[PDB]
Design a protein around this nucleic acid. Structure first.
Ligand code: MG
Ligand code: MG
Ligand code: MG
Ligand code: MG
Ligand code: MG
Ligand code: MG
Ligand code: MG
Ligand code: MG
Ligand code: MG
Ligand code: MG
Ligand code: MG
Ligand code: MG
Ligand code: MG
Ligand code: MG
Ligand code: MG
Ligand code: MG
Ligand code: MG
Ligand code: MG
Ligand code: MG
Ligand code: MG
Ligand code: MG
Ligand code: MG
Ligand code: ZN
Lengths: 178, 175, 37, 141, 130
RNA sequence: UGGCACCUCGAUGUCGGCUCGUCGCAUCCUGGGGCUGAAGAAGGUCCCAAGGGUUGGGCUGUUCGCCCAUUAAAGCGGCA
RNA sequence: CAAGUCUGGGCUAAGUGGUAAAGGAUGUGGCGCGGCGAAGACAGCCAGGAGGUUGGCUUAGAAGCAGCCAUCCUUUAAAGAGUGCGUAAUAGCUCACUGGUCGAGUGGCGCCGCGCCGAAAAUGAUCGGGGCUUAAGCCCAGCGCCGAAGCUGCGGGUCUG
RNA sequence: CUGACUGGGGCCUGUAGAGCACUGAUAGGGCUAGGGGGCCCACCAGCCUACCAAACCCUGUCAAACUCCGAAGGGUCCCA
């Protein structure tokens, strides 16, 4: 939220990304405009401002762009972003991945598993007005054998549901005994 | 944070501090001392207090400020007999009798150790169970007291050692 | 202990002193003092 | 140790170790990850020695995740044997790894215990392997 | 003043007319019972004047900017920090100085304590009937 | 012990012993010191230190190795 | 040994330069984040450093301290079913938490450049040598110069067209 | 004037890279042909499996003898 933008006109940018200015591009239906953003601003807001939050982008034309992230290319033996694909949202039920989480006792806390399969809560498409910030999933009693999620009780409030599948969701794993 | 030298000297019985353009000579009611000073750092000799001033901030100006002040601060109370520096001895049958200045003492050896003192060191012996080393300068007393430590090493499973104040943290017994 | 290549702070009251070029680590109890060498 | 039970061919080559990662940088399973920085090989003895050093370290909770699998047979000739006369015997399968690939991923272990556990298993490997946590650097859209 | 505002508001709101602004522990004669001598007036006038105090020039500067300044005692010497509210105040002051200064080493009551929208004195506080 | 085959096939004599030494320390002792599950002696380990010593024999061609009597010790290696 | 003890900005105190790794360390110099702070901050020196509570057969013994439950509350101007010892367990010493007379800065980090230890072999040692510390090393620059049998200045011969 | 080489046009490949749709191995999760079996019941009239496990689907991988893909280049032919 509230990040500055600039322009690119087919530059060098491997030489421009030395002082913390990684390139980018944004679009909703057209106008594939090449931009570059700042790395400590984008990284600092990108600490907690995840995929679910609409990161808005000030532009020198005076517009505030409701963007989000499409991909962050890892530098892969440097752990850095090369290029981040922004996505402007328009009057359209666009796709969203919302990091929902789990609250409650996992499996009767002493006899508890791990509950590690977050997987970014596979897909929810939404209108730009009914877009959420947080949706809650509880883990009320889910001990080791039975009581799995299986995405059957995956009715979120409103808009929308998961479109095609109901198969990828968290489960309970046994611990590591000695 | 307070760098030593950001707080002043002032000294009643106001002993004389002179220029001595590379060093510091201090003359008091009892004796005179000597403090070497780095020539780049400027200590000044104003009324009452002895000021200290450093040029810049590196690994020598930030430590020599505080070295140079504090070695004067030892010589402030040094020339007015401000050091007692006891050495209390333990032992079943240990004592330290004095003949003149060469302090012989029985520390369990086959011969009483004759301690030859240097110039300006007074072995005040009020008790057979404790002595004290006096003088003028703190280095001259602590070095000779370390030489008294050089005979007998304490904390070897039991008593019969010296501790400079008395501090048995020796170790567990061995039965 | 005694002369080791790695120096770590067992029993957190260690003080780490770099004297005469090399690293010593000292405590009250002398069975935990270390020299790096 | 562990080994692949079936193969198309028994012996295979060595190749080179260039390339950046070819997949395996995002964690996506656990909250922490032991990521490598130098190109080398991972023997099954290095897998076992690092896997035992987790379950013996932390107990009663925390599932350990390994994302390495040895499919490359390390070929070594017997001792005091002259050159030629075919390849050597197969002793233990090794796993090729690239820099910036996450090998070991703890699960259900806290900060001050997972830094320590990944620090213990970091010394079992011949690679400078730094430790990364769960960040927002996933590949989601 | 960054994290300590509600804690300063627990001694800078109802303190419009303080009482025992004397000396706290100060080595000699400091509780040493933890039942009646520690809380002093809790064996008589309950717990409505047993300080709450994290200040001597901290929130006391806020109390010296709010209403008046209550009283002026330790600000250069060493006497820790002691506050109150009301409760007994003019009533059981000799009992509070008897349980707070009934033993210890001699009589460590309170240096300059306030008394009902004004101030107190040293002789009137230590050797006072009010 | 090996791998390689780079000078040596108009050849650079191969094991071991006797005499004669010299050098390194990653020290067997003697000289200092820290720790110890170091009460003292005798110990264990580690740091510095190569200045000097490192026996007389039986066995087998033996280097090595196994035993007798001692010493504080009967060190490991290089120098074709 | 022919040519700058050249002009600038930093860096290194190890002879690194001028011998190599895993690992380790208040070694320095630079960048960014967080808390605290002159409604007085860190290390300091003094403080009643606590009541249910030795919570419960815990196998002798479980008083915070071999290891278990489901992890408290309330008295307070700050305090747990306790930070390390020390006890068979006790007791006790220090406390995490905090009150001041002081004093204007104070800790955890993530990178980054040069460093230290790791680094012990056999005739006499050394980076070529002597020597070298705001350099006679290392990083970014700039203007010159030295520097071949290379190219041009000139002369002479040969071969091909 | 065709040559080495270069410029403008085509054609070809299955290497680097990348990928699992094909050939195999695979870290987990869900479903469970069935099997030591069944809590044990007039055997099918079940129940959870913390017992094993076929096949399938996802989150994740690896490959000289795997390619749904696929360059940089090289070769060849026409003109300069
Ligand atoms: Mg050889
Ligand atoms: Mg050959
Ligand atoms: Mg010949
Ligand atoms: Mg021959
Ligand atoms: Mg021959
Ligand atoms: Mg040695
Ligand atoms: Mg040795
Ligand atoms: Mg010795
Ligand atoms: Mg002994
Ligand atoms: Mg010699
Ligand atoms: Mg010798
Ligand atoms: Mg010259
Ligand atoms: Mg080196
Ligand atoms: Mg310069
Ligand atoms: Mg020519
Ligand atoms: Mg010519
Ligand atoms: Mg042509
Ligand atoms: Mg051609
Ligand atoms: Mg071409
Ligand atoms: Mg291929
Ligand atoms: Mg490949
Ligand atoms: Mg082509
Ligand atoms: Zn310590």
């Amino acid at each position: 939220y509230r990040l500055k933008a600039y322009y690119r006109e087919g530059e060098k940018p491997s030489a421009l990304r030395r002082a913390g200015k990684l390139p980018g591009v944004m679009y909703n239906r057209h106008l594939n405009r090449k931009v570059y953003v700042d790395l400590v601003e984008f990284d600092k807001v990108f600490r907690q401002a995840s995929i679910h939050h609409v990161i808005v982008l000030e532009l020198p034309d005076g517009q505030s762009l409701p963007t989000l992230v499409r991909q962050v290319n890892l530098d892969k033996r440097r752990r850095r972003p090369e290029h981040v694909d922004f996505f402007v949202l328009s009057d359209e039920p666009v796709e969203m991945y919302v990091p929902l989480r789990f609250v409650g006792t996992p499996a009767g806390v002493r006899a508890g598993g791990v509950l590690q399969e977050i997987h970014r809560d596979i897909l929810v498409k939404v209108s730009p007005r009914n877009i959420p910030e947080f949706i809650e999933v509880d883990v009320s009693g889910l001990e080791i054998g039975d009581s799995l999620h299986a995405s059957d009780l995956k009715l979120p409030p409103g808009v929308e549901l998961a479109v095609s599948p109901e198969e990828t969701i968290a489960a309970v794993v046994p611990p590591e005994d000695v | 944070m307070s760098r030593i030298g950001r707080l002043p000297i002032p000294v009643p019985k106001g002993v004389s501090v002179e220029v001595a353009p590379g060093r510091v000579k201090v003359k008091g009611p009892k004796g005179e001392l000597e403090v070497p000073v780095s020539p780049e750092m400027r200590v000044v000799v104003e009324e009452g207090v002895v000021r200290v001033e450093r040029p810049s901030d590196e690994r020598r100006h930030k430590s020599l400020h505080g070295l140079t002040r504090t070695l004067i601060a030892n010589a402030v109370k040094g020339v007015s007999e401000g050091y007692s520096k006891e050495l209390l001895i333990k032992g079943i049958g240990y004592r330290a009798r004095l003949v003149g200045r060469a302090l012989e003492l029985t520390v369990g050896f086959s011969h009483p150790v004759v301690v030859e003192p240097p110039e300006g060191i007074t072995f005040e012996v009020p008790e057979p169970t404790r002595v004290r080393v006096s003088g003028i300068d703190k280095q001259k007393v602590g070095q000779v007291a370390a030489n008294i430590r050089a005979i007998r090493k304490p904390s070897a499973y039991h008593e019969k050692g010296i501790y400079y104040a008395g501090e048995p943290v020796r170790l567990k017994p061995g039965k | 202990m005694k002369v080791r290549a790695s120096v770590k702070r067992i029993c957190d009251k260690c003080k780490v002193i770099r004297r005469h070029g090399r690293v010593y680590v000292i405590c009250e109890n002398p069975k935990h003092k270390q020299r790096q060498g | 140790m562990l080994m692949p039970r079936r193969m198309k061919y028994r012996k295979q080559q060595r190749g080179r170790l260039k390339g950046a990662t070819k997949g395996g940088d995002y964690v996506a399973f656990g909250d922490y990850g032991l990521v490598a920085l130098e190109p080398a090989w991972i023997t099954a003895q290095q897998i076992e020695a690092a896997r035992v050093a987790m379950v013996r370290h932390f107990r009663r909770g925390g599932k350990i995740f390994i994302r390495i699998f040895p499919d490359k047979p390390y070929t070594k000739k017997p001792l005091e044997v002259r050159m030629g006369k075919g390849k050597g015997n197969v002793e233990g399968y090794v796993a090729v790894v690239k820099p910036g690939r996450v090998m070991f991923e703890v699960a259900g272990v806290t900060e001050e215990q997972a830094m320590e556990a990944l620090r213990i298993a970091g010394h079992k490997l011949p690679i400078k392997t730094k430790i990364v946590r769960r960040d927002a650097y996933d590949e989601a859209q | 003043x960054x994290x300590x505002x509600x804690x300063x508001x627990x001694x800078x709101x109802x303190x419009x007319x303080x009482x025992x602004x004397x000396x706290x522990x100060x080595x000699x004669x400091x509780x040493x019972x933890x039942x009646x001598x520690x809380x002093x007036x809790x064996x008589x006038x309950x717990x409505x004047x047993x300080x709450x105090x994290x200040x001597x020039x901290x929130x006391x500067x806020x109390x010296x900017x709010x209403x008046x300044x209550x009283x002026x005692x330790x600000x250069x010497x060493x006497x820790x920090x002691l506050x109150x509210x009301x409760x007994x105040x003019x009533x059981x002051x000799x009992x509070x100085x008897x349980x707070x200064x009934x033993x210890x080493x001699x009589x460590x009551x309170x240096x300059x304590x306030x008394x009902x929208x004004x101030x107190x004195x040293x002789x009137x506080x230590x050797x006072x009937x009010x």
